[PDB]
Design a binder for these strands. Structure first.
Ligand SMILES: [Mn+2]
Length: 190
DNA sequence: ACTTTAT
DNA sequence: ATAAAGTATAGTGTG
C-alpha cells in the first residue's frame, strides 16, 4: 500500500469550514453512528476555533511587530492516510499508533507546538487524519519558508520511510508522479 | 520571479 | 520604499 500525505494551505477564511468538518459540528460518506469513534491527538480545547488558537499562538510568539497578513497561511493541513487494504490489517491500538507516529514525524521535524490539531476520522470510507501544522519558525509565520518544493519532495521520501521504520508496511508514492490532485468531490466522480 | 501586504 | 510572505510545490485516494 502507498503512504498518502498531502497538505492544503488554510487561511483565516477556510479554517471555519475545516473546524466544522473536523469536529463534526450528513454527507453520503459520513456514517453518523461511527462519529463518536473519532478522536483528537493534540491536547487542544474543542470549544476554541482553529483560527483563534493559531492566531493567538502566532501573535503571542512572533518576533515582528507587524500584524499577521490577512492572506496568511495560518496552517498547512496535512491529510495522512493510505488505502483501505492497509487499515484492514490493523486493530484499533495499531490504527491509533499509526496516526500518533505520523504526528510525531511532523512534531520532531517542524516543532511540537506547531501541531495545532490532529483529528482522526473513522466515520468516513477509510481511516485518515487531518493534521494542521502551523508554519511557524524562528518567530516567523511562513508556509513559504517551511513547505517549499524541496521540502515536499523530502517528505514524500522520508515520511513513508520513517513510518516503515516504525512498524508500518507502507511504500512511498511514485517518485516524480505525474498525477494531478483531485478534490474529494472530483475524485468521487472518478 | 513577480505581486501583495502592512508598515 | 521596503521586505516578508503571498502564489505551487509532492504525493494517492472515495480525506
Ligand atoms: Mn475527514
Amino acid at each position: 500500500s502507498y503512504m498518502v500525505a498531502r497538505m492544503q494551505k488554510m487561511k483565516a477564511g477556510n479554517l471555519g469550514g475545516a473546524f466544522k468538518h473536523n469536529e463534526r459540528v450528513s454527507n453520503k460518506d459520513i456514517n453518523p453512528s461511527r462519529s463518536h469513534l473519532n478522536y483528537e491527538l493534540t491536547d487542544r480545547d474543542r470549544s476554541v476555533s482553529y483560527e483563534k488558537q493559531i492566531k493567538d499562538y502566532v501573535n503571542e510568539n512572533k518576533v515582528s511587530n507587524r500584524a499577521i497578513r490577512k492572506d496568511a497561511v495560518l496552517c498547512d493541513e496535512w491529510i495522512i492516510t493510505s488505502d483501505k487494504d492497509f487499515f484492514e490489517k490493523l486493530d484499533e491500538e495499531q490504527t491509533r499508533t499509526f496516526f500518533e507516529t505520523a504526528k510525531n514525524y511532523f512534531a520532531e521535524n517542524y516543532g511540537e507546538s506547531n501541531i495545532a490539531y490532529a483529528s482522526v476520522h473513522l466515520d468516513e470510507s477509510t481511516p485518515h487524519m487531518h493534521m494542521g501544522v502551523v508554519p511557524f519558525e524562528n518567530g516567523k509565520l511562513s508556509s513559504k519558508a517551511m513547505f517549499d518544493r524541496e521540502e515536499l519532495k523530502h517528505i514524500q521520501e522520508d515520511l513513508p520511510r520513517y513510518m516503515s521504520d516504525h512498524g508500518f508496511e507502507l511504500e512511498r508514492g511514485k517518485l516524480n508522479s505525474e498525477a494531478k490532485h483531485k478534490t474529494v468531490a472530483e475524485f468521487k466522480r472518478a
